[PDB]
Amino acid sequence: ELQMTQSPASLSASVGETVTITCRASENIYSYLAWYQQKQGKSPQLLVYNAKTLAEGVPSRFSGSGSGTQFSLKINSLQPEDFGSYYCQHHYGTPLTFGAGTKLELKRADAAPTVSIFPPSSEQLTSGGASVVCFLNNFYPKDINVKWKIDGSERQNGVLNSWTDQDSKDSTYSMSSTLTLTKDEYERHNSYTCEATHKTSTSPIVKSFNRNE
């Protein structure tokens, strides 16, 4: 099928700044190209159609350009309401296809995650399971790596991570990482460590506890 290659996948910017998102079609689609905006937890909204015509209600700071196989959406002097995801879509013929999306996020000062580790609750243990939870909260930028070590050795199996999108109030990100083991598995080991690698530190942030201590 016709493929739309959209870039960048992710873009950071400040209010007042001008940014450009690009979309390449694998075939000549003339000027049949649309752009959409999708904010967190909302349905998409049309911004541009016919490559350059603004949709109803769209501010003049947005502009679409291009015709053939290369297109771009430019946003002059970004406003706070402009952060969210953007998608291109050709509207030449069926099948209709979309670009993979660009996530436009708001720049703010770096922030190291506040890392907190929690041993399995005694209540969960009586039930037989053992989940070790680690929260890595309010950090920026979003890129982060979490590693679990049990008695000095990295553990991979049994880890489930969940992330929040950029906070609408402070522009940070948060993450939760949970290592789930059986109670038997849990009771065989002693030291449990959650290690976070983030640009704010050359060395990882390490939080840990000893089951028997």
Binding site: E1, Y32, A34, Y36, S43, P44, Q45, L46, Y49, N50, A55, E56, Y87, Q89, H91, Y92, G93, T94, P95, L96, T97, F98, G99, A100, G101, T114, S116, I117, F118, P119, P120, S121, S122, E123, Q124, S127, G129, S131, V133, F135, N137, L160, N161, S162, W163, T164, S174, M175, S176, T178, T180, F209, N210, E213
Partner: protein
């Protein structure tokens, strides 16, 4: 206005079918084509196909050939999409979307989306576990609540019945072996906990369950 009233969320087993609807109002139904688009959580958009209510003409994405069937009823200004032989891969939000008046392949009014969840799981209330810091683990302290193994979504988590909200982080649920698990953290001044009570309130309407758990310091 323009309004698209979509049918409620669907919870069905693998191999079953679901038929969703979207009742349009606020414009002349037959003057616009109706597209359908699939979006999985945190992922992109995929076009399924469209129907032109004026002449019943349809076009389908070959990728959905055989799984999706689009129909419409002019009498009630309603468009329908039936998905068959469902598997968990079909779990997603599905939008009915009005095409533009002239550029009818541009999607100018998107519905709210109908959530479809395909699973063999049975209703399961969550196990709610209070998370207090280890005995060993300064101005602030972070506490947590693990809401594990429930089905189906969603659950609502509040702290001190909502009085604590600014320092709260409730994370998206993750699916593991057919059941959902999520966690929520709250950060408060160390001068307030444990001297004052902090409670996790969890609600899971599907199982008609409500649980309140005070976060208590570990007896170590």
């Amino acid at each position: 206005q323009v309004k698209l009233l979509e049918s409620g969320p669907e919870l069905v087993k693998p191999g079953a079918s679901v038929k969703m609807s979207c009742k349009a109002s606020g414009y002349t139904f037959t003057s616009y084509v109706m597209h359908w688009v699939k979006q999985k959580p945190g992922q992109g958009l995929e076009w399924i196909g469209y129907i032109n209510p004026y002449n019943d003409g349809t076009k389908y994405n070959e990728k959905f050939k055989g799984k999706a069937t689009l129909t419409s009823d002019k009498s009630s200004s309603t468009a329908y999409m039936e998905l068959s032989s469902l598997t968990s891969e079909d779990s997603a939000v599905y939008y009915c979307v009005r095409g533009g008046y002239r550029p009818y392949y541009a999607m100018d009014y998107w519905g709210q989306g109908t959530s479809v969840t395909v699973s063999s799981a049975k209703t399961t209330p969550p196990s709610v576990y209070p998370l207090a810091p280890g005995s060993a683990a300064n101005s602030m302290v972070t506490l947590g609540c693990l809401v594990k193994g429930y089905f189906p979504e969603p659950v609502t988590v509040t702290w001190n019945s909502g009085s604590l909200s600014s320092g709260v982080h409730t994370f998206p649920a993750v699916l593991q072996s057919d059941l959902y698990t999520l966690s929520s953290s709250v950060t408060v001044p160390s001068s307030t906990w444990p001297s004052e009570t902090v409670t996790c309130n969890v609600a899971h309407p599907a199982s008609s369950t409500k649980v309140d758990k005070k976060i208590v310091p570990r007896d170590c």
